Design a protein around this ligand. Structure first.
Ligand SMILES: Nc1nc2c(ncn2[C@@H]2O[C@H](COP(=O)(O)CP(=O)(O)OP(=O)(O)O)[C@@H](O)[C@H]2O)c(=O)[nH]1
Ligand SMILES: Nc1nc2c(ncn2[C@@H]2O[C@H](COP(=O)(O)CP(=O)(O)OP(=O)(O)O)[C@@H](O)[C@H]2O)c(=O)[nH]1
Ligand SMILES: Nc1nc2c(ncn2[C@@H]2O[C@H](COP(=O)(O)OP(=O)(O)OP(=O)(O)O)[C@@H](O)[C@H]2O)c(=O)[nH]1
Ligand SMILES: [Mg+2]
Ligand SMILES: [Mg+2]
Ligand SMILES: [Mg+2]
Lengths: 423, 429, 429
């Protein structure tokens, strides 16, 4: 009766969704053919025959990666009216994804939403797997979110996004993407989510015993996070926290909606022993700086709000002693005027494995993330100091002052976390 | 006669009633189906007060189950004692309150309230004589905060003489399971101080403590967390459902205790409590049941009676027992803790003796306490309110529902009006 | 009536009580479980004084077991007579006193003392009439030194009239099992001389001697070392628990013996003692039980009565016996050892005759002695104190706990105040 649809924008989001719906089919026992040999209306719908289809929309301006789903192993799962392709990519140009090509096939993707919104009645959240690296994953992202608040307005819109890395950075105009996309995702998204590529590597290198990771394995870490956020809807625990509450819990002021995800425990197969993984053991590893997936030191700021989504085998009194430890420390410290800073969620379902006992997803809306914007503002100034690459965005119809209008917009964003940090 | 209509709300309070009606099932020999299997004919003599005897050897729980999402209603009907209820009475919404008081009281509270108030009317018409209404919910969630408090103001508009008791859990002192637990307390404080006749107040942390201090448990489940309140609620009306050497009911407990209608916020107490094997190495008699009550640790609300002053004391016993073994114990303990009480009441110990024990041990006692210790918890809660209010955070949700600061401020002032009055009689002696 | 509450401490004193309550078990027909199996109805007539009769044919040892590490409590509960106790009364810490008096009296002594003083209060409230408190501990260890002595000063603040006796082992004369045995004696001397009504004092070496001289044993275990004190403690109150031709109890032994409250440090004596086969080749009668007491070797405190002067003499007999067979023996032996006594008391021999023997031999006698021989042991102990004090060694532990030299010096002076007073009446005649 309760639903939560998903949209995938750009090439980086599709390869996230290739591992996500790989995991969801293994959750409810679904085959790649939509077949299984109760309450799962959030991510699936039933046909007239005994087949289930995903509530997913795959958009791309280049026809490459969607053919990898249209010819891959997960081929028969998807409705061919969902698989939407373009012809010419934005090709790491935000003005092409926002003005040139994305304005043409915008009619088809938005029409597929209401075709999914017929059978949905408990519409409780949206999923937009979009990166800020590629132009298609960013230029279409701004055009998509404008119509939905015109469409729904009151319904929830969540973005499990990918943060551009401060050191290991692939493309060139990746600093140009973030400042331009700021005005959309601060005025439409109810709670955006930042994940950096860079912190994943040492988790793969040290904690997962494989120094040289693959992008197939980078998606496996985030796909476990997205499932355990939905662990209250898809199942039944003693304390089920639905997605309406998170945007009401984690948001003290309606502009501040940038937490970070933290999955724990992250172990290897050989290190599955030499440990016991009690509920007090693993939550201290959550607040370890080298276990999070965002390159931000949590002891460089203060926590505004914290959330903990447990699964597996959990007794709350045993967690009650675990939370009592973290308030009674000193290197871990909160925003002082928020003394009630925990949101606990327990599900009695084990964390499934993709080819352990319990697992924790930590969601901490903190002030440690605010330094990451300043590391990216420093990138954007010098490339705009030369007026470099202006003839591509202006070459694809964009105002020069539209950079400058969004330039001060980050300063009003940055002064928020500075103001909340002091008493 | 004098039948009682049961209303639930929230998500915590439903699972308590999911255990509480199991307690009433074996306190009346009621099977999980709905038929009867008891042998003692004292059950059938007053069976009507918590059960409608339906047609054809049936008994249904006179209870109104209310939620705002179909999950918890599914969990009750699938597990134990779910088919015993009437499927007509599973009256529940589809949205979920979102852990917002204003969603449970203004927007989504107005929807399902009409479906409930006919069911309240259908039971109150069907009852021969009506005694009072009881409510089990939360003060931390959304559905337990707004939806239950919206009902009681409509019921006080209906019935002036009928009593009302809420077994509402106090928001937690130190652990913070709810992020907005002041915003679910303070907006719920104002409804409770106006038109609730007596109000039960249970801290979370002491319930963890009593399950750990006396019993010494390792993995306490909610089937054993919330079970202590289920025996507690049964001990309130256990003199109603069976005869005694000194009977009692919900009106006798009200007028004896509450000295002024703004001071009616009570604390429980239960005895005896043992371990699984450490149960025989103790003289489990009346003086052991005497001194097990009056200590600070037995209170399910975490408060020190040493840091406060009592006003009145009720005590409900169960099982056959003598009297001077009780009465001198119920007299002398006022003299050893002499300065802890207040001056202006002679013999503030109300005694109640039923003649039926629990299904189990031979004798049992239920303590109902009233003291000035609870107001010191609210000064923390008023601090927890103002800490999230001196920056005026979390307002745009309630602004999105529509509410001025004065409704927050006067309820905080009315919370301070509770502060100004439990301190007033405490300062007096 | 006149029930007695039992407190233990230390590590030696617990194993003594681990044997002593086995003695009281077969002196009342008490099984290892807690039920009753005796046949003589004189046991049940006064069973209450060392046992609470719990609910349902039960009997529990009215005893308070206290340690500071979970090892010795585990050894009691796993071995014999461990399930007979109440699991509520195993009240013990987790650190261990570290063989420091100041850890047992200042830092870690303040922690567990609140858990004990309710259990003392819970037993003293439950007792109909209270007689006095008894303590079995060490004077050499840490837990027996500080923790037991911290309790008794709090008890003298409670009860002025209740008697108090400590069966405290004297630190050893020649063998040095404890490195800091003056620092566990002298700081424990000051507590015993203030507010202990009578005080039992047993040397270690004579207990090795009596187990080797009379019995001629080869491998003496603590089950036979500490067993002699267990029969000794039972002979103190054996006229209380059963009728006699001349009864006695703990108050009759106090006021008869102690001539001035600073002189109350006593010595025991037990008879008869044989070998396994050398047990019939002796006329085990009253004159053999007469002369077995008064020699130097029977004293469990290693002291020579020839090198000292008595003040008073108590004697408690067990089993049926005549009187002129006793009385002339209890009169003539004062005249053969005439100069060894003191002048200013006529007939200093207190006689006590119960009418119940031990479970075993036909007649038995318990000697309670008081002499000036014990002060000569303290001059060794004051020398042992000053030998480790004239260099001022081992101070940084007590400095780390916090203590001036004057607390060491005045207690050494108060030890010398014991020297100045047992010598005073010895110099007098
Ligand atoms: N003693 C218990 N406390 C509980 C239990 N479940 C939740 N809680 C507490 O109750 C509070 C949450 O309230 P609810 O369980 O009633 C959530 P509710 O349906 O009222 O509203 P929503 O937030 O819209 O779901 C919070 O303080 C929890 O710590 C339980 O089974 N026992
Ligand atoms: N006659 C006996 N003397 C004993 C026995 N065990 C120890 N002792 C003596 O007692 C002294 C040691 O004291 P304890 O056994 O009570 C050690 P305690 O728990 O009091 O403190 P800690 O040093 O902190 O462990 C020392 O003089 C030993 O020689 C025993 O079973 N019998
Ligand atoms: N999360 C995630 N990010 C990836 C992966 N592979 C590449 N990326 C990042 O995704 C960004 C590139 O975005 P894309 O989605 O591939 O490109 P696009 O949005 O389709 O736009 P164009 O290819 O320029 O037309 C860069 O920052 C890459 O580091 C992956 O497997 N997972
Ligand atoms: Mg691409
Ligand atoms: Mg709920
Ligand atoms: Mg020891």
């Amino acid at each position: 009766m309760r639903e939560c649809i998903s949209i995938h924008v750009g090439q980086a989001g599709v390869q996230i969704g290739n591992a996500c719906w790989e995991l969801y089919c293994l959750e409810h026992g679904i085959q790649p053919d939509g077949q299984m040999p109760d309450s799962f209306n959030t991510f699936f719908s039933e046909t007239g025959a005994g087949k289930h289809v995903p509530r997913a929309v795959f958009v791309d301006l280049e026809p490459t990666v969607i053919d990898e789903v249209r010819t891959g192993t997960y081929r028969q799962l998807f409705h061919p009216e969902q698989l939407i392709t373009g012809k010419e990519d934005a090709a790491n140009n935000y003005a092409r994804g926002h003005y040139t090509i994305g304005k043409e096939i915008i009619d088809l993707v938005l029409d597929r939403i209401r075709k999914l919104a017929d059978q949905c009645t408990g519409l409780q959240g949206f999923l937009v797997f979009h990166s800020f690296g590629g132009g298609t994953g960013s230029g279409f992202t701004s055009l998509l979110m404008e119509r939905l608040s015109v469409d729904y307005g009151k319904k929830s819109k969540l973005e499990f996004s990918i943060y551009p890395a401060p050191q290991v950075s692939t493309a060139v105009v990746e600093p140009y993407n973030s400042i331009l996309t700021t005005h959309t995702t601060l005025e439409h998204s109810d709670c955006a989510f930042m994940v950096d590529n860079e912190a994943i590597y040492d988790i793969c290198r040290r904690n997962l015993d494989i120094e040289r990771p693959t992008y197939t394995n980078l998606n496996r870490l985030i796909s476990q996070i997205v499932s355990s956020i939905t662990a209250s809807l898809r199942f039944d625990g003693a304390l089920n926290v639905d997605l309406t509450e998170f945007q009401t819990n984690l948001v003290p002021y309606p502009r501040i909606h940038f937490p970070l995800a933290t999955y724990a425990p992250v172990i290897s197969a050989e290190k599955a022993y030499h440990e016991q993984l009690s509920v007090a053991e693993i939550t201290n590893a959550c607040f370890e700086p080298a276990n999070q997936m965002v390159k931000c030191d949590p002891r460089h700021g203060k926590y505004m709000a914290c959330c903990l989504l447990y699964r597996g085998d959990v007794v709350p009194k045993d967690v009650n002693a675990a939370i009592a430890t973290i308030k009674t420390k000193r290197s871990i410290q909160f925003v002082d005027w928020c003394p009630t800073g925990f949101k606990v969620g327990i599900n009695y379902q084990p964390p499934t494995v993709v080819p352990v006992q319990r697992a924790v997803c930590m969601l901490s809306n903190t002030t440690a993330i605010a330094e990451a914007w300043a590391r990216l503002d420093h990138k954007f100034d010098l490339m705009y100091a030369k007026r470099a690459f202006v003839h591509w965005y202006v070459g694809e119809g964009m105002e020069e002052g539209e950079f400058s209008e969004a330039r001060e917009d980050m300063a009003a964003l940055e002064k928020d976390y500075e103001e909340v940090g002091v008493d | 006669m004098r039948e009682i209509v049961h209303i639930q709300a929230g998500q915590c309070g439903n699972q308590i009633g999911a255990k509480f009606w199991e307690v009433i099932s074996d306190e009346h020999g009621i099977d999980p189906t709905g038929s009867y299997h008891g042998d003692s004919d004292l059950q059938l003599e007053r069976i009507n007060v918590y059960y409608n005897e339906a047609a054809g050897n049936k008994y249904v729980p006179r209870a109104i189950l209310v939620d705002l999402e179909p999950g918890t209603m599914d969990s009750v009907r699938s597990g134990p004692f779910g088919q015993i209820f009437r499927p007509d009475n599973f009256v529940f919404g589809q949205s979920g309150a979102g852990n917002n008081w204003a969603k449970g009281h203004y927007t989504e509270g107005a929807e399902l309230v009409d479906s409930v108030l006919d069911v309240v009317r259908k039971e109150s018409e069907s009852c021969d004589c009506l005694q009072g209404f009881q409510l089990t919910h939360s003060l931390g969630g959304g559905t337990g905060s707004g939806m239950g408090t919206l009902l009681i103001s409509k019921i006080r508009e209906e019935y002036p003489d009928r009593i009302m008791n809420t077994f509402s859990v106090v928001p937690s002192p130190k652990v913070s399971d709810t992020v907005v637990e002041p915003y679910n307390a303070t907006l719920s404080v104002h409804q409770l101080v106006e038109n609730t006749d007596e109000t039960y107040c249970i801290d979370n942390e002491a319930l963890y403590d009593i399950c750990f201090r006396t019993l010494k448990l390792t993995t306490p489940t909610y089937g054993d967390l919330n079970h202590l309140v289920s025996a507690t609620m049964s001990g309130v009306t256990t003199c109603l459902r069976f005869p005694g050497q000194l009977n009692a009911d919900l009106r006798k407990l009200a007028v004896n205790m509450v000295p002024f209608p703004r001071l009616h916020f009570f604390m429980p107490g239960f005895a005896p409590l043992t371990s699984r094997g450490s149960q025989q190495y103790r003289a489990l008699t009346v003086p052991e049941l005497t001194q097990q009550m009056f200590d600070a640790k037995n209170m399910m609300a975490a408060c020190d009676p040493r840091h406060g002053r009592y006003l009145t004391v009720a005590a409900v016993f169960r099982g056959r027992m003598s009297m001077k073994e009780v009465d001198e114990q119920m007299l002398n303990v006022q003299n050893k803790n002499s300065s802890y009480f207040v001056e202006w009441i002679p013999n503030n110990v109300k005694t109640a003796v039923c003649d039926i024990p629990p299904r189990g041990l031979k004798m049992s006692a239920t303590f109902i306490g009233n003291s000035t210790a609870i107001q010191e918890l609210f000064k923390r809660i008023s601090e927890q309110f103002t800490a999230m209010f001196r920056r005026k955070a979390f307002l745009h949700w309630y602004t999105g529902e529509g509410m001025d600061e004065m409704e927050f401020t006067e309820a905080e002032s009315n919370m301070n009006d509770l502060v100004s009055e439990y301190q007033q009689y405490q300062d007096a002696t």
